[PDB]
Structure formats: C-alpha cells, structure tokens
Design brief:
The complex is a heterodimer. Chain A is mainly β. In chain A, strands 6, 10, 13, 14 and 16 form a five-stranded antiparallel β-sheet that branches. In chain A, strands 7-8-15-11-12 form a five-stranded antiparallel β-sheet, with no helix packed on it. A three-stranded antiparallel β-sheet of chain A has the order 1-2-3. Chain A starts with a helix and ends with a strand. The N and C termini of chain B lie far apart (about 60 Å). By secondary structure, chain B is mainly β. The chains are: A mainly beta, B mainly beta. At the A-B interface, strand 9 and strand 16 of A face strand 1 of B. Chain A: It comes from Fusarium oxysporum f. sp. lycopersici. Chain A: This is Avirulence protein 1.
Chain lengths: ~180, ~25
Amino acid sequence: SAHTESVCVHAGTATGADLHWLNAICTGKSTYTVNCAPAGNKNAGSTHTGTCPAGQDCFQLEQVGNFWGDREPDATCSPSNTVFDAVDDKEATHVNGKVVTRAGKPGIGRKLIRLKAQVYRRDGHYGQTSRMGFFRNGKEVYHIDNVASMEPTWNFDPSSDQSFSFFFTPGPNAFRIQGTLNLAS
Amino acid sequence: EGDIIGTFNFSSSDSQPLKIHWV
C-alpha cells in the first residue's frame, strides 16, 4: 500500500537502498509491521514498524501483489469510523471469554446490511477462532464456530438497532478481529 | 470489426463500508 511502501522507502534512505514491501501486518488499532526487501533481492527481508495517521485504523489486506509479483498480506489505513477491530489486550473489551470491538450504528435508514468480519493470525493471514459473531444492543445475537470469517445479513432498523459490535474467541490462530458493516441485497 | 480486445469493468462503490456512529 502507499503506507507500507512509504515505510520501506524511508527505511532504505540511510543506505541508499531501493526497498519495497514484501508483506505487512496490522498489530493493533493503528499500528502495523512491514517486512521490506531490496528490489534486487527479495530474500533479504528486514522488519520495520509504522502507525496509521490520526483518525485512522490499520486495515489488514490479503493476497495483494507486491513488487516481485507475490500475493501477500498488506496493510493500509482506513477511517476509524468505518472499521471495527480489536486484539486481545487489557483495554480490549472482554465478555464471557470473548474479545469484543467498539459498538456503533450506521447512519442509514431501514436497509439490509451485511456484518463482515474475519480473524487474523499474528502473521497477518486469515486465522481460525473457536467462536466469532456479533452483539446487537449489547447482547450476543449471532455466533459461528470454528471459522476464519463471518458474513451474516441483517435487516437494519434504526428504531430497534442501537448498536452492533463484533467478537471473537482468542487463540493461537486468532490475534485480531476486523469487521465492517456493508449494504447487502 | 471494431471488436475491442481486453476486459471492461464498470463496478460501483456501493459495497463500501458504512460510516459508524459509536456509542
């Protein structure tokens, strides 16, 4: 991404190196780690960190083609009011063994929506959780077991739906959850 | 004759994430 490539370009100036991103991983709400390598030797990776600008969260991407043509995890930055995310840390919300994101409401009318979320490993790839789902109005209303992702639909109604949040069950293959609300049909 | 070689894609942005108002 523009952001992860910039991390590599800035990392290479001190040695005149022509570095490009190999892959990149979200490590928190706004932080990410990039692995960089010289254009002439994809094998010579080095690790470097970045942080998304104010008002933006890290957004994990998958199967993004890098400079050498390999499809890899990548990271970009997205407005913090368009993405849900959480890792297992102290000021993550914990409920009944689950890590829960912030809760919020879209500003649309009565519409069918999709609640899309995935869990990710520490290496930035899709992972696996024993249980993941979403809360509505502060209560667990949907869950799905032993998966990397969820995408239930829902007839959103602003009069009855005050908030949604996503949750996952942390484990060796579930470090971060990332979710969005989207129009569906 | 006049057939265009290649691929067109007219996709919209309606699938974009919705803006969220947090509680």
